[PDB]
Coordinates of C-alpha atoms in Angstrom, one line a residue:
Chain A
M1 CA 71.4 70.3 -37.8
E2 CA 74.0 68.9 -35.4
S3 CA 76.0 65.7 -35.0
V4 CA 76.4 64.1 -31.6
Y5 CA 79.5 62.2 -30.4
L6 CA 79.6 59.8 -27.4
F7 CA 83.0 58.8 -26.1
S8 CA 81.7 57.9 -22.7
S9 CA 80.5 54.4 -21.6
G10 CA 77.0 53.9 -20.2
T11 CA 73.4 53.1 -21.0
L12 CA 71.3 54.8 -23.7
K13 CA 67.6 55.5 -23.0
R14 CA 65.0 58.1 -23.9
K15 CA 64.3 60.3 -20.8
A16 CA 61.2 62.4 -21.8
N17 CA 62.0 63.8 -25.1
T18 CA 65.8 63.6 -25.0
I19 CA 68.5 61.0 -25.0
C20 CA 70.1 60.0 -21.7
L21 CA 73.4 58.3 -21.2
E22 CA 73.7 56.9 -17.7
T23 CA 77.3 56.3 -16.8
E24 CA 79.1 54.8 -13.8
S25 CA 79.6 58.5 -12.7
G26 CA 76.5 60.4 -13.7
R27 CA 73.9 61.1 -16.3
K28 CA 74.6 62.9 -19.6
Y29 CA 71.5 64.5 -21.2
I30 CA 71.5 65.2 -25.0
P31 CA 68.4 67.0 -26.5
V32 CA 67.2 65.6 -29.8
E33 CA 65.6 68.7 -31.4
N34 CA 68.5 69.7 -33.7
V35 CA 70.2 66.3 -33.9
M36 CA 70.8 64.7 -37.3
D37 CA 72.9 61.7 -36.1
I38 CA 74.8 60.0 -33.3
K39 CA 78.3 58.5 -33.4
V40 CA 79.1 56.0 -30.7
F41 CA 82.8 55.5 -29.8
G42 CA 82.1 54.2 -26.3
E43 CA 80.8 51.0 -24.8
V44 CA 77.0 51.4 -24.6
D45 CA 74.0 49.2 -23.7
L46 CA 70.6 50.0 -25.3
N47 CA 67.2 48.6 -25.9
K48 CA 64.8 48.5 -28.9
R49 CA 62.6 51.2 -27.4
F50 CA 65.6 53.5 -27.6
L51 CA 65.9 52.6 -31.3
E52 CA 62.2 53.2 -31.9
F53 CA 62.7 56.6 -30.4
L54 CA 65.6 57.4 -32.7
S55 CA 63.5 56.1 -35.6
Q56 CA 60.7 58.4 -34.8
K57 CA 63.0 61.4 -34.4
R58 CA 64.7 60.4 -37.6
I59 CA 68.2 60.1 -36.1
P60 CA 70.5 57.4 -37.4
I61 CA 73.2 56.1 -35.0
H62 CA 76.7 55.0 -36.1
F63 CA 78.8 52.6 -34.1
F64 CA 82.6 52.5 -33.9
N65 CA 84.6 49.9 -31.9
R66 CA 87.3 50.9 -29.4
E67 CA 90.1 50.8 -32.0
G68 CA 88.1 53.4 -33.8
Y69 CA 87.0 51.3 -36.7
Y70 CA 83.5 51.7 -38.1
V71 CA 81.5 48.6 -37.3
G72 CA 78.1 49.7 -38.6
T73 CA 75.0 51.9 -38.6
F74 CA 71.4 51.7 -37.3
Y75 CA 69.5 53.1 -40.3
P76 CA 66.0 54.1 -39.4
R77 CA 63.0 53.4 -41.6
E78 CA 63.0 55.9 -44.5
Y79 CA 60.6 58.8 -43.9
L80 CA 61.2 60.2 -47.3
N81 CA 59.6 57.9 -49.8
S82 CA 59.2 58.5 -53.5
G83 CA 58.3 55.8 -55.9
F84 CA 59.5 57.6 -59.0
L85 CA 62.9 58.6 -57.7
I86 CA 63.8 55.2 -56.3
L87 CA 62.7 53.8 -59.6
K88 CA 65.0 56.2 -61.4
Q89 CA 67.9 55.5 -59.0
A90 CA 67.6 51.8 -59.9
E91 CA 67.1 52.1 -63.6
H92 CA 70.1 54.5 -63.7
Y93 CA 72.1 51.7 -62.2
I94 CA 70.9 48.8 -64.4
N95 CA 71.3 50.9 -67.5
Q96 CA 75.0 50.5 -68.4
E97 CA 75.3 53.9 -70.2
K98 CA 73.4 55.8 -67.5
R99 CA 75.5 54.2 -64.8
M100 CA 78.7 55.2 -66.6
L101 CA 77.5 58.7 -66.9
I102 CA 77.0 59.1 -63.1
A103 CA 80.2 57.3 -62.2
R104 CA 82.3 59.4 -64.6
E105 CA 80.7 62.5 -63.1
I106 CA 81.7 61.3 -59.6
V107 CA 85.3 60.6 -60.7
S108 CA 85.6 63.8 -62.7
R109 CA 84.5 65.9 -59.7
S110 CA 86.8 64.0 -57.4
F111 CA 89.8 64.7 -59.7
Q112 CA 89.0 68.4 -59.9
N113 CA 88.5 68.7 -56.1
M114 CA 91.9 67.0 -55.7
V115 CA 93.6 69.2 -58.2
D116 CA 92.4 72.6 -56.7
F117 CA 93.1 71.3 -53.2
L118 CA 96.7 71.0 -54.4
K119 CA 96.7 74.3 -56.3
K120 CA 95.2 76.2 -53.4
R121 CA 98.3 75.3 -51.4
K122 CA 100.5 76.3 -54.4
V123 CA 101.5 72.7 -54.9
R124 CA 102.1 71.6 -58.5
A125 CA 99.5 68.9 -59.2
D126 CA 100.7 68.5 -62.7
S127 CA 100.4 64.7 -62.5
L128 CA 96.9 63.2 -62.0
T129 CA 96.4 64.5 -65.6
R130 CA 97.4 61.1 -66.9
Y131 CA 94.8 59.6 -64.5
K132 CA 92.2 62.1 -65.7
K133 CA 92.9 61.2 -69.3
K134 CA 92.9 57.5 -68.5
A135 CA 89.5 58.1 -66.8
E136 CA 87.9 59.5 -70.0
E137 CA 89.2 56.7 -72.2
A138 CA 87.8 53.9 -69.9
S139 CA 85.0 51.7 -71.3
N140 CA 83.6 50.5 -68.0
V141 CA 82.8 51.4 -64.4
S142 CA 85.2 48.8 -62.9
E143 CA 88.3 50.3 -64.6
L144 CA 87.0 53.7 -63.6
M145 CA 87.1 52.6 -59.9
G146 CA 90.7 51.4 -60.3
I147 CA 91.8 54.6 -62.0
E148 CA 90.2 56.6 -59.2
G149 CA 92.1 54.6 -56.7
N150 CA 95.5 55.1 -58.4
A151 CA 94.8 58.8 -58.8
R152 CA 94.0 59.1 -55.1
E153 CA 97.2 57.2 -54.2
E154 CA 99.2 59.5 -56.5
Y155 CA 97.4 62.5 -55.0
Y156 CA 98.2 61.3 -51.4
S157 CA 101.8 61.4 -52.6
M158 CA 101.8 64.9 -53.8
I159 CA 100.2 65.7 -50.4
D160 CA 102.8 64.2 -48.2
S161 CA 105.0 66.8 -49.8
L162 CA 104.2 69.6 -47.5
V163 CA 104.4 67.4 -44.4
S164 CA 107.6 68.0 -42.5
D165 CA 107.5 65.3 -39.9
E166 CA 108.7 62.5 -42.0
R167 CA 107.4 59.7 -39.9
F168 CA 104.0 61.5 -40.0
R169 CA 103.7 60.8 -43.7
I170 CA 101.3 58.5 -45.6
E171 CA 104.1 56.3 -47.0
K172 CA 101.7 53.9 -48.7
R173 CA 98.0 53.5 -48.0
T174 CA 97.3 51.2 -45.1
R175 CA 94.4 49.1 -44.2
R176 CA 93.0 47.2 -42.4
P177 CA 94.7 48.2 -39.2
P178 CA 96.6 51.4 -40.0
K179 CA 100.3 50.7 -39.9
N180 CA 101.4 54.3 -39.1
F181 CA 100.3 57.7 -38.0
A182 CA 99.0 59.3 -41.2
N183 CA 96.7 56.5 -42.4
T184 CA 95.2 56.2 -38.9
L185 CA 94.1 59.8 -39.1
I186 CA 93.1 59.5 -42.8
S187 CA 91.2 56.3 -42.2
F188 CA 89.4 57.7 -39.2
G189 CA 88.5 60.9 -41.0
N190 CA 87.3 59.0 -44.1
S191 CA 85.1 56.9 -41.8
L192 CA 83.6 60.0 -40.1
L193 CA 82.8 61.3 -43.5
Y194 CA 81.2 58.1 -44.8
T195 CA 78.9 58.1 -41.8
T196 CA 78.2 61.8 -42.3
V197 CA 77.3 61.4 -46.0
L198 CA 75.2 58.4 -44.9
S199 CA 73.2 60.4 -42.4
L200 CA 72.7 63.1 -45.1
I201 CA 71.4 60.5 -47.6
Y202 CA 68.8 59.6 -45.0
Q203 CA 67.6 63.2 -45.3
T204 CA 66.9 62.7 -49.0
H205 CA 64.7 60.4 -51.1
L206 CA 67.7 58.4 -52.2
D207 CA 68.5 54.9 -51.1
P208 CA 72.1 54.6 -49.7
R209 CA 72.3 50.9 -51.0
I210 CA 72.4 51.9 -54.6
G211 CA 75.7 53.5 -55.7
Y212 CA 77.2 54.1 -59.1
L213 CA 81.0 54.4 -59.0
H214 CA 81.1 51.8 -56.3
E215 CA 79.1 48.8 -57.6
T216 CA 75.8 48.0 -56.1
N217 CA 76.0 44.5 -54.5
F218 CA 73.9 44.4 -51.5
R219 CA 76.7 43.9 -49.0
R220 CA 77.0 47.5 -48.0
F221 CA 76.0 51.1 -48.5
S222 CA 77.4 52.4 -51.8
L223 CA 76.0 55.8 -52.6
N224 CA 77.6 57.3 -49.4
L225 CA 81.0 55.9 -50.6
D226 CA 80.5 57.5 -54.0
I227 CA 79.6 60.9 -52.7
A228 CA 82.4 60.9 -50.1
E229 CA 85.0 60.8 -52.8
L230 CA 84.2 64.4 -53.7
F231 CA 84.5 65.8 -50.2
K232 CA 87.7 63.9 -49.0
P233 CA 90.0 66.9 -49.8
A234 CA 87.8 69.6 -48.3
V235 CA 87.0 67.7 -45.1
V236 CA 89.5 64.9 -44.4
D237 CA 92.6 66.1 -46.2
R238 CA 92.5 69.8 -45.1
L239 CA 91.8 68.5 -41.6
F240 CA 94.8 66.2 -41.8
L241 CA 97.2 68.8 -43.1
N242 CA 95.9 71.5 -40.6
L243 CA 96.1 69.1 -37.7
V244 CA 99.6 67.7 -38.4
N245 CA 101.1 71.2 -39.2
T246 CA 100.0 72.8 -36.0
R247 CA 101.3 69.7 -34.1
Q248 CA 97.9 69.6 -32.3
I249 CA 98.1 65.8 -32.8
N250 CA 101.2 64.0 -31.5
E251 CA 102.7 60.6 -30.8
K252 CA 100.9 60.6 -27.5
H253 CA 97.7 60.2 -29.6
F254 CA 98.5 56.7 -30.9
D255 CA 98.5 53.4 -29.2
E256 CA 100.9 50.7 -30.3
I257 CA 98.3 48.1 -29.5
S258 CA 96.8 45.9 -32.2
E259 CA 99.6 45.1 -34.5
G260 CA 99.3 48.5 -36.1
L261 CA 98.0 51.9 -35.0
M262 CA 94.8 53.1 -33.4
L263 CA 93.6 56.7 -32.7
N264 CA 93.1 57.1 -28.9
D265 CA 90.4 58.9 -27.0
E266 CA 92.8 61.7 -26.7
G267 CA 93.1 62.6 -30.4
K268 CA 89.6 61.1 -31.1
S269 CA 87.9 64.0 -29.4
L270 CA 90.4 66.5 -30.8
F271 CA 89.9 65.0 -34.3
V272 CA 86.2 65.0 -33.8
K273 CA 86.2 68.6 -32.7
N274 CA 88.2 69.9 -35.7
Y275 CA 86.4 67.5 -38.1
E276 CA 83.1 68.7 -36.9
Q277 CA 83.8 72.5 -37.1
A278 CA 85.2 71.7 -40.6
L279 CA 81.6 70.8 -41.4
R280 CA 80.1 74.1 -40.2
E281 CA 82.2 76.2 -42.5
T282 CA 80.7 78.6 -45.0
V283 CA 81.2 80.6 -48.2
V284 CA 76.3 77.5 -47.0
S285 CA 77.9 74.8 -44.8
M286 CA 80.1 72.0 -46.0
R287 CA 77.4 69.7 -44.8
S288 CA 74.8 71.7 -46.9
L289 CA 77.2 71.3 -49.8
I290 CA 77.1 67.5 -49.5
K291 CA 73.3 67.7 -49.3
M292 CA 73.3 69.9 -52.4
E293 CA 75.3 67.4 -54.5
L294 CA 72.8 64.8 -53.3
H295 CA 70.0 67.0 -54.5
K296 CA 71.8 67.6 -57.8
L297 CA 72.0 63.8 -58.2
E298 CA 68.2 63.5 -57.6
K299 CA 67.5 66.3 -60.1
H300 CA 69.7 64.3 -62.5
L301 CA 67.9 61.0 -62.0
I302 CA 64.6 62.6 -62.9
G303 CA 65.9 64.5 -65.9
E304 CA 66.6 68.0 -64.6
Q305 CA 70.0 69.5 -64.8
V306 CA 71.8 66.8 -66.8
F307 CA 75.4 65.8 -66.2
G308 CA 77.5 66.4 -69.3
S309 CA 75.6 66.9 -72.6
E310 CA 72.3 65.8 -74.1
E311 CA 72.9 63.1 -76.7
Chain B
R1 CA 63.9 14.7 -41.2
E2 CA 61.3 15.3 -43.9
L3 CA 61.8 18.6 -45.6
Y4 CA 65.0 20.6 -46.3
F5 CA 65.5 24.3 -46.9
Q6 CA 68.1 25.5 -49.3
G7 CA 69.7 28.9 -48.7
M8 CA 70.6 30.9 -45.6
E9 CA 68.3 31.6 -42.8
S10 CA 66.3 34.5 -41.4
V11 CA 66.0 34.3 -37.6
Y12 CA 62.7 35.6 -36.2
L13 CA 62.9 36.6 -32.6
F14 CA 59.5 37.2 -31.0
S15 CA 60.7 36.8 -27.4
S16 CA 61.7 39.6 -25.2
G17 CA 65.1 39.5 -23.4
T18 CA 68.7 40.4 -23.7
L19 CA 70.8 39.8 -26.8
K20 CA 74.3 38.8 -25.9
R21 CA 77.5 37.3 -27.4
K22 CA 79.0 34.3 -25.5
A23 CA 80.7 31.8 -27.9
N24 CA 81.1 32.3 -31.6
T25 CA 77.3 31.9 -31.3
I26 CA 74.8 34.3 -29.8
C27 CA 72.0 33.9 -27.3
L28 CA 68.8 35.6 -26.1
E29 CA 68.7 35.7 -22.4
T30 CA 65.1 35.9 -21.1
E31 CA 64.1 35.1 -17.6
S32 CA 64.2 31.3 -17.1
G33 CA 65.9 29.9 -20.3
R34 CA 68.6 30.9 -22.7
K35 CA 67.6 30.7 -26.4
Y36 CA 70.8 29.9 -28.3
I37 CA 70.8 31.0 -31.9
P38 CA 73.6 29.5 -34.1
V39 CA 74.8 32.1 -36.6
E40 CA 76.5 29.8 -39.2
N41 CA 73.6 29.6 -41.6
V42 CA 72.0 32.9 -40.6
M43 CA 71.9 35.8 -43.1
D44 CA 69.9 38.1 -40.9
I45 CA 67.9 38.6 -37.7
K46 CA 64.4 40.1 -37.3
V47 CA 63.6 41.3 -33.8
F48 CA 59.9 41.6 -32.8
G49 CA 60.4 41.5 -29.0
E50 CA 61.6 44.0 -26.6
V51 CA 65.4 43.4 -26.5
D52 CA 68.4 44.7 -24.7
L53 CA 71.8 44.7 -26.4
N54 CA 75.2 46.5 -26.3
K55 CA 77.8 47.6 -28.8
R56 CA 79.9 44.4 -28.2
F57 CA 76.9 42.4 -29.6
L58 CA 76.7 44.7 -32.6
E59 CA 80.4 44.2 -33.1
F60 CA 79.8 40.5 -33.2
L61 CA 77.0 40.7 -35.8
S62 CA 79.2 43.1 -37.7
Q63 CA 82.1 40.5 -37.7
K64 CA 79.7 37.8 -38.8
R65 CA 78.3 40.3 -41.4
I66 CA 74.8 39.7 -40.1
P67 CA 72.4 42.7 -40.1
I68 CA 69.6 42.8 -37.5
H69 CA 66.2 44.2 -38.4
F70 CA 63.9 45.8 -35.7
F71 CA 60.1 45.8 -35.6
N72 CA 57.7 47.3 -33.1
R73 CA 54.7 45.9 -31.2
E74 CA 52.3 45.8 -34.2
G75 CA 55.2 44.5 -36.4
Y76 CA 55.9 47.7 -38.2
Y77 CA 59.5 48.2 -39.3
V78 CA 61.4 50.8 -37.3
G79 CA 64.9 50.3 -38.8
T80 CA 68.0 48.0 -39.3
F81 CA 71.5 47.7 -38.0
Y82 CA 73.6 47.3 -41.0
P83 CA 77.2 46.1 -40.5
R84 CA 80.0 47.8 -42.5
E85 CA 79.8 44.9 -44.8
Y86 CA 77.1 42.2 -44.6
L87 CA 76.0 39.0 -46.3
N88 CA 74.2 39.5 -49.6
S89 CA 70.8 40.6 -48.7
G90 CA 69.0 39.5 -51.8
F91 CA 67.4 42.9 -52.0
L92 CA 65.2 42.9 -55.1
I93 CA 65.1 46.7 -55.9
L94 CA 67.1 46.3 -59.2
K95 CA 65.1 43.3 -60.3
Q96 CA 62.0 45.3 -59.6
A97 CA 63.0 48.3 -61.7
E98 CA 64.0 45.9 -64.4
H99 CA 60.5 44.3 -64.5
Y100 CA 58.9 47.8 -64.3
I101 CA 60.6 49.5 -67.2
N102 CA 60.1 46.5 -69.4
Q103 CA 56.5 46.7 -70.5
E104 CA 56.2 43.0 -71.1
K105 CA 57.5 42.0 -67.7
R106 CA 55.4 44.7 -66.0
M107 CA 52.3 43.6 -67.9
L108 CA 52.9 40.0 -66.8
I109 CA 53.0 41.0 -63.1
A110 CA 50.1 43.4 -63.4
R111 CA 48.0 40.9 -65.3
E112 CA 48.7 38.4 -62.4
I113 CA 47.4 41.0 -59.8
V114 CA 44.2 41.6 -61.8
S115 CA 43.6 37.9 -62.6
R116 CA 43.7 37.0 -58.9
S117 CA 41.8 40.1 -57.8
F118 CA 39.0 39.1 -60.1
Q119 CA 38.8 35.5 -59.0
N120 CA 38.8 36.5 -55.4
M121 CA 35.9 38.9 -56.2
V122 CA 34.0 36.1 -57.9
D123 CA 34.6 33.6 -55.1
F124 CA 33.5 36.0 -52.5
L125 CA 30.2 36.6 -54.4
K126 CA 29.5 32.9 -55.1
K127 CA 30.2 32.0 -51.4
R128 CA 27.4 34.4 -50.5
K129 CA 25.1 33.2 -53.2
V130 CA 25.3 36.3 -55.4
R131 CA 25.6 36.2 -59.2
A132 CA 29.1 36.9 -60.3
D133 CA 28.5 36.7 -64.1
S134 CA 28.5 40.4 -64.6
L135 CA 32.2 40.4 -63.9
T136 CA 33.0 38.1 -66.8
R137 CA 33.1 41.1 -69.3
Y138 CA 35.9 42.6 -67.2
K139 CA 37.9 39.4 -67.1
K140 CA 37.9 39.3 -70.9
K141 CA 38.7 43.0 -71.2
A142 CA 41.7 42.5 -68.8
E143 CA 43.0 39.7 -71.0
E144 CA 42.7 41.8 -74.2
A145 CA 44.3 44.9 -72.7
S146 CA 47.8 45.4 -74.1
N147 CA 48.6 48.5 -71.9
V148 CA 48.9 48.6 -68.0
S149 CA 47.1 51.9 -67.8
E150 CA 44.1 50.4 -69.5
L151 CA 44.5 47.5 -67.0
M152 CA 44.2 49.6 -63.9
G153 CA 41.1 51.2 -65.3
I154 CA 39.5 47.9 -66.0
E155 CA 40.2 46.6 -62.5
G156 CA 38.7 49.7 -60.9
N157 CA 35.6 49.4 -63.0
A158 CA 35.3 45.7 -62.1
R159 CA 35.6 46.7 -58.4
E160 CA 32.8 49.2 -58.7
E161 CA 30.5 46.6 -60.3
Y162 CA 31.6 44.2 -57.7
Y163 CA 30.7 46.7 -55.0
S164 CA 27.2 47.2 -56.5
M165 CA 26.7 43.4 -56.2
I166 CA 27.9 43.6 -52.6
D167 CA 25.1 46.1 -51.9
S168 CA 22.5 43.3 -52.4
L169 CA 23.8 41.7 -49.2
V170 CA 23.2 44.8 -47.2
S171 CA 19.9 45.0 -45.3
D172 CA 19.9 48.6 -44.1
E173 CA 20.1 50.9 -47.1
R174 CA 21.6 53.7 -45.0
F175 CA 24.6 51.3 -45.0
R176 CA 24.6 50.5 -48.8
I177 CA 27.7 51.4 -50.7
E178 CA 25.6 52.7 -53.6
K179 CA 28.4 53.9 -55.9
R180 CA 32.1 53.6 -55.0
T181 CA 34.5 55.5 -57.2
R182 CA 38.0 57.0 -57.0
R183 CA 36.3 59.8 -55.0
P184 CA 33.9 57.8 -52.9
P185 CA 30.6 59.5 -51.8
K186 CA 30.1 60.5 -48.2
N187 CA 28.1 57.9 -46.4
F188 CA 28.5 55.2 -43.8
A189 CA 29.6 52.3 -46.0
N190 CA 32.3 54.2 -47.9
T191 CA 33.7 55.5 -44.6
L192 CA 34.1 51.9 -43.5
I193 CA 35.5 50.6 -46.8
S194 CA 38.0 53.4 -46.9
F195 CA 39.0 52.8 -43.3
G196 CA 39.3 49.0 -43.8
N197 CA 41.3 49.5 -47.0
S198 CA 43.8 51.9 -45.3
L199 CA 44.3 49.3 -42.6
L200 CA 45.0 46.6 -45.3
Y201 CA 47.4 48.9 -47.1
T202 CA 49.4 49.4 -43.9
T203 CA 49.3 45.7 -43.2
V204 CA 50.6 44.7 -46.6
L205 CA 53.3 47.4 -46.3
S206 CA 54.7 46.2 -43.0
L207 CA 54.8 42.6 -44.4
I208 CA 56.7 43.8 -47.4
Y209 CA 59.3 45.4 -45.1
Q210 CA 59.7 41.8 -43.7
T211 CA 60.7 40.7 -47.3
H212 CA 63.4 41.4 -49.9
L213 CA 60.9 43.5 -51.8
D214 CA 60.9 47.3 -52.0
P215 CA 57.4 48.8 -51.5
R216 CA 58.1 51.9 -53.5
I217 CA 57.9 50.1 -56.9
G218 CA 54.5 48.8 -58.0
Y219 CA 53.2 47.3 -61.2
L220 CA 49.4 47.5 -61.6
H221 CA 49.7 51.0 -60.0
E222 CA 52.0 53.5 -61.7
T223 CA 55.2 54.0 -59.9
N224 CA 55.1 57.7 -59.5
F225 CA 55.7 60.2 -56.7
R226 CA 53.3 58.4 -54.4
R227 CA 55.1 57.0 -51.4
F228 CA 54.2 53.3 -51.7
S229 CA 52.8 51.4 -54.7
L230 CA 53.5 47.7 -54.4
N231 CA 51.4 47.5 -51.2
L232 CA 48.5 48.9 -53.1
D233 CA 49.0 46.2 -55.8
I234 CA 49.0 43.2 -53.4
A235 CA 46.1 44.6 -51.3
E236 CA 43.9 44.3 -54.4
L237 CA 43.8 40.5 -53.8
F238 CA 42.8 40.6 -50.2
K239 CA 40.1 43.4 -50.2
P240 CA 37.2 41.0 -50.4
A241 CA 38.3 38.4 -47.7
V242 CA 39.5 41.0 -45.2
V243 CA 37.8 44.4 -45.7
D244 CA 34.5 43.4 -47.4
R245 CA 33.8 40.4 -45.2
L246 CA 34.4 42.6 -42.3
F247 CA 32.2 45.4 -43.7
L248 CA 29.2 43.1 -44.3
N249 CA 29.6 41.2 -40.9
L250 CA 29.8 44.4 -38.9
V251 CA 26.9 46.4 -40.5
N252 CA 24.6 43.4 -40.7
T253 CA 25.1 42.5 -37.0
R254 CA 24.8 46.1 -36.1
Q255 CA 28.2 45.9 -34.3
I256 CA 28.8 49.0 -36.4
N257 CA 25.9 51.3 -36.8
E258 CA 24.9 55.0 -37.1
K259 CA 25.9 55.7 -33.5
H260 CA 29.6 55.2 -34.6
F261 CA 29.8 58.1 -37.0
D262 CA 30.3 61.9 -36.7
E263 CA 29.7 64.7 -39.3
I264 CA 32.9 66.7 -38.7
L265 CA 31.8 62.2 -42.1
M266 CA 34.2 60.1 -40.0
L267 CA 34.3 57.0 -37.8
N268 CA 34.5 57.9 -34.1
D269 CA 37.1 56.4 -31.8
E270 CA 34.9 53.7 -30.5
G271 CA 33.8 52.8 -34.0
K272 CA 37.5 52.8 -35.0
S273 CA 38.5 50.5 -32.1
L274 CA 35.8 48.0 -32.7
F275 CA 36.7 47.9 -36.4
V276 CA 40.5 47.6 -35.7
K277 CA 40.1 44.8 -33.2
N278 CA 37.8 42.8 -35.6
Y279 CA 40.2 43.6 -38.4
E280 CA 43.1 42.2 -36.4
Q281 CA 41.0 39.2 -35.7
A282 CA 40.3 38.8 -39.4
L283 CA 44.0 38.6 -40.2
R284 CA 44.4 35.7 -37.8
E285 CA 41.3 33.9 -39.2
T286 CA 42.2 30.8 -41.2
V287 CA 40.8 29.7 -44.6
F288 CA 41.3 26.6 -46.6
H289 CA 43.9 26.7 -49.3
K290 CA 43.5 23.8 -51.7
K291 CA 46.9 24.2 -53.3
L292 CA 48.6 23.4 -50.0
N293 CA 45.6 21.4 -48.8
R294 CA 45.7 23.2 -45.5
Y295 CA 44.5 26.1 -43.4
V296 CA 46.5 29.3 -43.3
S297 CA 45.8 32.7 -41.7
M298 CA 45.1 35.6 -44.0
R299 CA 48.4 37.2 -42.9
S300 CA 50.1 34.1 -44.2
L301 CA 48.2 34.3 -47.5
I302 CA 49.5 37.9 -47.9
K303 CA 53.0 36.7 -46.9
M304 CA 52.8 33.9 -49.5
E305 CA 51.7 36.2 -52.3
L306 CA 54.7 38.4 -51.6
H307 CA 57.0 35.4 -51.7
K308 CA 55.4 34.4 -55.0
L309 CA 56.4 37.8 -56.4
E310 CA 59.9 37.4 -55.0
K311 CA 60.3 34.1 -56.8
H312 CA 58.9 35.5 -60.0
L313 CA 61.3 38.4 -59.9
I314 CA 64.4 36.2 -59.7
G315 CA 63.3 33.7 -62.4
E316 CA 62.6 30.8 -60.0
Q317 CA 59.0 29.7 -60.6
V318 CA 58.0 32.5 -62.9
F319 CA 54.2 33.1 -62.9

């Protein structure tokens, strides 16, 4: 299935069966047949009937503001409903041991994906081992989240080595507004990935509001944040290195506005193009891989294909 | 001022118009007036009308961490706009799993369903001058059951006995229920009861989506690979007052009769429309509730029962 990006401003409405964007120039027609989700970077007006249409065609829509920051998602009514699996997803959260199992699995796979990302490029990863060891010794999920963060930070280091352009380095991790080039790209890519995983969760019986590594408070989607940790090297990080090495993205692609950096229309479309094609890549697609690990979680929640060992 | 409400607020918008951001507050622009909605105490917005909005308005709600839920004409839930981060939604899914996997807590909730279902059955029969005493044995069995599976069985059997008593109110025997089981016989009455029940199930479901409850976890019914359970549980309470009252009234006044059915056995489109309109009329019909000492619509009664479960789940006013 395909992911639709709208950078142009206009009005969203269903035409017959299709989505139409009416701009101040002309009409853009996008067919819904193959569409899994929509990402809106432009300024758009829409009505509820348009949302009802998206809901019936099972297409979520993600909204980004002009600075390129993710504001939120319209999540359609779930068409995949399973009492048992939802029950299992929740009892696996409220059970402290079961929750720890899943969370540790998430972290463990994140670390290995980081480590082979680095080894694939013939970079010595030899650190992160202390973070891996600190991860096994942890007694609770919260400490695990902090360890995962410090490991990612250290791994972002060992990345920058292999970026020539100095000033195009991560330095240290910046939010909320990215304070330089690298983080702007990394934050944007991560965002695209969060929404991607989110759209994919919608294609399963899982509820995106219950995560494991990231605590479930009901202030946000969690599960998509958890799963995204696995795929950050393969999608975002390879994209970042590939993009900055070929100099396809340059200083012309950032705007000094906003007390920090934004990614412009400019690099947004370029980023989106490369990012997307990164999702079609195959041994099965990257996007199918994300769905597969979601499936693997579901198999786990109901007792098939356990993580770790039977105790 | 008389009453006071403690917590944040759910804004229900039934009016059509345009949703817009002006001040640090938002407004609905219809023709004629502007309806101003202060956001300060609002945790979420539920839109039943036909509304226009843009991304700038969504950016505002996102900044205020206020999600907005969308519902269609009939009030069925289409979807929600969730901000990146939003105010605590009070979503009860974890509390629900917790009272399901604990057999004592599950029993307590299921026993509540059965208890009320039985009393509603008895009241319906006594209002119509029919003997309800046969049902007493099932009430006692329900009380002595220590397993939920046993409890669903007892409730079903009670229902079937109840249905046999309902048949004494039916003049035309072509329209008698005879026996209704888990696989109902093919005849006029069971075609109606099945149809009415399905409508009720959908009604309870859409109302649950307007709450903090998740419909996929039930209590009296096993939570299994079935799509929705909780709606089935709650519907057990309202089957007499909505479905059964409607069934009797329609077949005895011949509003529904043999001209409304086809063998390929199903209710034809005219028979469906007549039933649906009357059904939708039933949900608006008001009955006396002595506990509040007022009259409420049946839709409110269902709403209230859902809120009762909500309060039970969080420990406030446990059953």
